[PDB]
Design a protein around this nucleic acid. Structure first.
Ligand SMILES: [Zn+2]
Ligand SMILES: [Zn+2]
Ligand SMILES: [Zn+2]
Lengths: 56, 164, 138, 43, 49, 147, 119, 56
DNA sequence: GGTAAGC
RNA sequence: CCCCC
DNA sequence: GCTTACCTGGTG
């Protein structure tokens, strides 16, 4: 993110959410959680036809 | 008799070319033919594979490093061994000998394939072996309406399962 | 907004890592075959190798990049002047058609007027540089 | 009055952004347990 | 090309901040590649900071 | 692994060497072309010792010289002779192959051909690298040891 | 391999043998130019490329505000003013070594503990 | 629980320390290879694991 | 817009 | 289309 | 060894 420095490999910079859903996510954590969230939804959307035609 | 004269000539010269020179003229000659007599013990000019043995003896002597193989070959050092040696590597020098060890070690490390540890939890218990050495991971298999999936692996027996 | 001029110029690095003589060629609009980069530069007025080289590799100490350009120099040896280069498109009829393509259809952004060949030449050199920069693990 | 600017994704690549004016601005010159854990004024 | 890109970059940024160059025009300096990219271009998604 | 050899790591390493497809390119550090006109006396001072050997017991002034990596060579249980002989059989009586022996600091192979001459040596170096099998089975591109 | 260009026409020079005196020459194909060779080395092909250098350090590389800064003292000037980064030739097979460029004396230093690395 | 939240916070910070330590080790070209190759791949394994052990 | 079995 | 596990 | 000709989830 532009919020970090260059060459940052720290838990924070590479997507480690350290808080609980009870505590709340920081803006960065919120965005990185969204990045990895989307992951599944993409697969399920893509797979759907291939998984179907195999069934048939 | 090509080698019978050439093995000698090359041995004589590259054993006199040393800082030692030929003071042992009757012994440098004897050392050369004695090495050449047991040299023919390889094939006796019956196979060309004998010629390949010469190149080993000659090369390790010239080289520079090592210069000391020369001086110590006129001083003494086993002549029958320096034919059935195969010790092409153990003979000459020592910094290369140390380097070959480091090479061999590293290459054997390199040759081994990827491991991948996997972080385990006591929380889940296996079905078959009933052990709490479980390594999971989650994935959004269903719609955004229902939750993730959680795929557990038993790092003990090696068994895989799923969740809602 | 100069009438949907979607001209897609490609500068290809022919030949893989293992295959000898890795040649650089380019696809020109309305020009069927892929012209070797040297011939284009020659058709843009830049005639000797070394002047053509200077348009691509800005540093003389970069022996790596220059070695990759060596087979190109050889690839365009046959064409030795501008009218010879422009003819290597598609005679007389061939020479005008080429002038027009390199003028109006090649690198249409910047300018597509007439009095800028150097402007296009230097740009083609920039593309080749960025290409060779990726050919190298750079 | 040059207090606020417009930045596209290309220009963004060359800037370093603060999240909050407080959370990331004044230098350092007990803590709430209920509150979520944040980073720093790093540079 | 430009010999002192550091100064030019500042003279451009302050010129835009003043209003003299449209606030939407984008300017980037890539020190590593020795390049200065300017976009007057339509269709660029941008935010205020 | 063969029954009573399944516990020996060193056995498996040797089998690995016997299986994995090893090219000349896989062991080569670099290949050079020199104008070395005297066969009896090399322009390269390093190669002095290589000459004094493969000579003590009409060709081409153009020299193809390739340096090999000890580590690479050692991983696949190879030696200068084995490598040289493979080049000697892939080119037959067309190329003149001489080489440095197994304990010299720098591992080198010197080549000479038998109008023009120069450009056909760049041709020979391409086929040399790209397609010379030293050890191994084709298609098997990488082999790893596992426990 | 440091290749030269023909005088007169700027065109690239190619090797040629002077069999008569056993020496190498470089001739022009666009004209009748011929010059002596320097090295006997006519072509080098490198397969194994051992490099992992610093970067395109402008004597004002410090102007980059996205760069991280350390309080490590300079080995030359002893100014605790530095800007750091990883290898710029960024191969997958690269060490995580850092290159500090002191803003005061513009000298490069490495975080290396394996050897006595400055470059 | 309150003291449990203290425990959980020092746990995350403890793993974060190990990460920084494996970072400073990698940064000073001291990090060792791993059969599972690349110094970079190797560093990321150690980091990833430490942060997973932390969540768990 | 991806694979294979045609010429 | 606009909705679904 | 290149060009063709087939295909690509379920309801409403
Ligand atoms: Zn189990
Ligand atoms: Zn000339
Ligand atoms: Zn300094």
């Amino acid at each position: 993110l532009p919020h970090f420095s260059k060459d940052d490999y720290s838990p924070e910079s590479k997507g480690f959410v350290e808080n609980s859903y009870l505590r709340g996510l920081t803006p960065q954590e919120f965005f990185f959680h969204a990045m990895g969230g989307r992951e599944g939804l993409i697969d399920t959307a893509v797979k759907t036809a291939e998984t179907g035609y195999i069934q048939r | 008799h090509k080698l019978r004269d050439q093995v000698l000539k090359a041995l004589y010269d590259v054993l006199a070319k040393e800082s030692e020179h030929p003071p042992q003229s009757i012994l440098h000659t004897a050392k050369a033919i004695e090495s050449e007599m047991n040299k023919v013990n390889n094939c006796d000019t019956n196979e060309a594979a004998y010629k390949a043995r010469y190149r080993i003896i000659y090369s390790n002597v010239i080289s520079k490093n090592n210069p000391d193989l020369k001086h110590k070959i006129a001083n003494g050092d086993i002549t029958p061994e320096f034919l059935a040696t195969c010790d092409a590597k153990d003979l000459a020098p020592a910094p290369l000998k140390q380097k070959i060890e480091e090479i061999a070690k590293q290459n054997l490390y390199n040759a081994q394939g990827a491991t991948i540890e996997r972080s385990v939890t006591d929380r889940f218990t296996c079905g078959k072996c009933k052990e709490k050495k479980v390594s999971y991971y989650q994935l959004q298999t269903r719609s955004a309406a229902a939750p993730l999936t959680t795929f557990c692996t038993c790092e003990a027996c090696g068994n895989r399962w799923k969740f809602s | 907004k100069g009438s949907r001029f979607i001209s897609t110029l490609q500068v290809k690095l022919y030949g893989r890592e293992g295959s000898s003589a890795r040649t650089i060629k380019a696809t020109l609009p309305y020009i069927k075959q892929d012209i070797p980069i040297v011939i284009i530069f020659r058709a843009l007025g830049i005639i000797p190798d070394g002047e053509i080289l200077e348009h691509i590799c800005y540093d003389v100490n970069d022996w790596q990049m220059l070695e990759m350009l060596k087979p190109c120099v050889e690839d365009g040896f046959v064409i030795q002047d501008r009218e010879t280069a422009l003819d290597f498109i598609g005679k007389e009829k061939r020479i005008q058609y080429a002038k027009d393509i390199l003028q109006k259809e090649f690198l249409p952004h910047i300018t597509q007027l007439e009095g800028f060949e150097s402007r296009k030449a230097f740009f083609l050199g920039y593309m080749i540089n960025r290409l060779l920069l990726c050919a190298l693990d750079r | 009055e040059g207090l606020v600017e417009y930045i596209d994704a290309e220009e963004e690549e060359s800037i370093l952004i603060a999240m909050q004016p407080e959370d990331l601005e004044p230098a350092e010159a007990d803590v709430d347990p209920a509150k979520r854990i944040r980073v720093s004024h790093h540079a | 090309v430009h010999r002192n890109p550091a100064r030019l970059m500042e003279t451009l940024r302050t010129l835009r901040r003043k209003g003299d160059i449209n606030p939407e025009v984008s300017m980037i300096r890539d020190i590593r590649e020795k390049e200065l990219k300017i976009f007057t271009d339509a269709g660029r998604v941008y935010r205020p900071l | 692994l063969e029954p009573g050899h399944a516990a020996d790591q060193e056995q498996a390493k040797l089998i690995r060497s016997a299986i994995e497809h090893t090219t000349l390119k896989s062991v080569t550090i670099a290949s050079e072309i020199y104008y070395d006109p005297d066969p009896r006396s090399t322009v390269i001072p390093e190669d002095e010792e290589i000459i004094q050997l493969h000579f003590s017991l009409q060709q081409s002034p153009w020299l193809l010289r390739l340096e090999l990596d000890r580590a690479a060579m050692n991983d696949k249980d190879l030696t200068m002779g084995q490598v040289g002989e493979r080049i000697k059989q892939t080119f037959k009586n067309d190329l003149f192959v001489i080489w440095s022996e197994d304990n010299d600091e720098k591992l080198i192979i010197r080549c000479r051909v038998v109008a023009e001459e120069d450009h056909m040596l760049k041709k020979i170096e391409n086929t040399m690298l790209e397609n010379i099998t030293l050890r191994g089975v084709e298609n098997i591109e990488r082999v790893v040891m596992m426990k | 391999t440091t290749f030269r260009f023909c005088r007169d026409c700027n065109n690239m020079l190619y090797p040629r043998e002077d069999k008569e005196n056993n020496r190498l020459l470089f001739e022009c194909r666009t004209c009748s130019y011929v010059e002596e060779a320097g090295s006997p080395l006519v072509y080098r092909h490198e397969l194994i490329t051992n490099i992992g250098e610093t970067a395109g350090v402008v004597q004002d590389i410090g102007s980059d505000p996205t760069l991280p800064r350390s309080d490590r003292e300079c080995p030359k000037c002893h100014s605790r003013e530095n800007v750091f980064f990883q290898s710029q030739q960024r191969r997958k097979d690269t060490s995580m070594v850092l290159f500090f460029v002191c803003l005061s004396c513009s000298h490069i230093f490495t975080s290396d503990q394996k050897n006595k690395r400055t470059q | 629980d309150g003291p449990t939240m203290r425990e959980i916070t020092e746990t995350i910070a403890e793993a974060k320390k190990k990460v920084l330590d494996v970072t400073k080790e990698a940064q000073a070209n001291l990090l060792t290879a791993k059969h599972g190759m690349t110094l970079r791949e190797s560093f990321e394994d150690n980091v990833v694991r430490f942060l997973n052990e932390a969540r768990d």
